[PDB]
Design a protein around this ligand. Sequence first.
Ligand code: NA
Lengths: 148, 149
Amino acid sequence: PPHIIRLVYKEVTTLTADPPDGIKVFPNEEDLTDLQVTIEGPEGTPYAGGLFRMKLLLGKDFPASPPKGYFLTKIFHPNVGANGEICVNVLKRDWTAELGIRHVLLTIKALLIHPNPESALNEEAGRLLLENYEEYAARARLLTEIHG
Amino acid sequence: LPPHIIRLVYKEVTTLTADPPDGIKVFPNEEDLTDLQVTIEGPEGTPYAGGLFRMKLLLGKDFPASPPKGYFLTKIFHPNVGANGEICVNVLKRDWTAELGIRHVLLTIKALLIHPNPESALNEEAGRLLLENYEEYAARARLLTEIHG
Ligand code: NA
């Protein structure tokens, strides 16, 4: 689909021109709907110092609906499930089709800073976060040192 | 107030001020390097979208040992903002260290507008609504944003 080609152009060029801090995007030359992404773990969080790889699958309907996202880097996070699937409450609730990849990635980076344990795919991470933050952070830091 | 802490605030606020993160602007005042004024744009795709939020950062005498105090001057309907604009930011209270800069504080506050923390809520009604009836929380938040942002 041509809109995908133009759309990836529009999305990737701007992302690389005024890059958000710690974010980089690698279009798969074989399949432009598969967008690979690295996000540096924000300072002052358990993910600090890590490089987190993820992919964004842009459906044919993008941007009518947001992409599906996966952390390829193993991570201990309330809103990241066993297969690496991401659940972002602002994406599934306040999405409009004027938004694009920049918004998606800033929302995911911001979720690393302030996870949402209510909508937790990883229920252990979510309970620790609310009830025993130090134990959540210790487990999030160790996976960061191994996998980031 | 120590002389070594001042040199680093000088350099950090200088580069912070001329090249801030997207949606952030910093306005130091000549009278007091420890009174920082900040505006944060409401991130697109949140109920704060389109608004411009004013806040101040105070660097106390224990800065950067203790983190700065933050206040929203713009009125906002947000779970982690108190009635007088006090900001409560959980990751800053728990994962703070002296090496973390002003830039990091402002990004964490901006990120907090995207993903509020209803469980640590200063604004009990905002936090409750976010968890039970997101659609009204968002409307209230959008209304205030339209008036004040
Ligand atoms: Na949150």
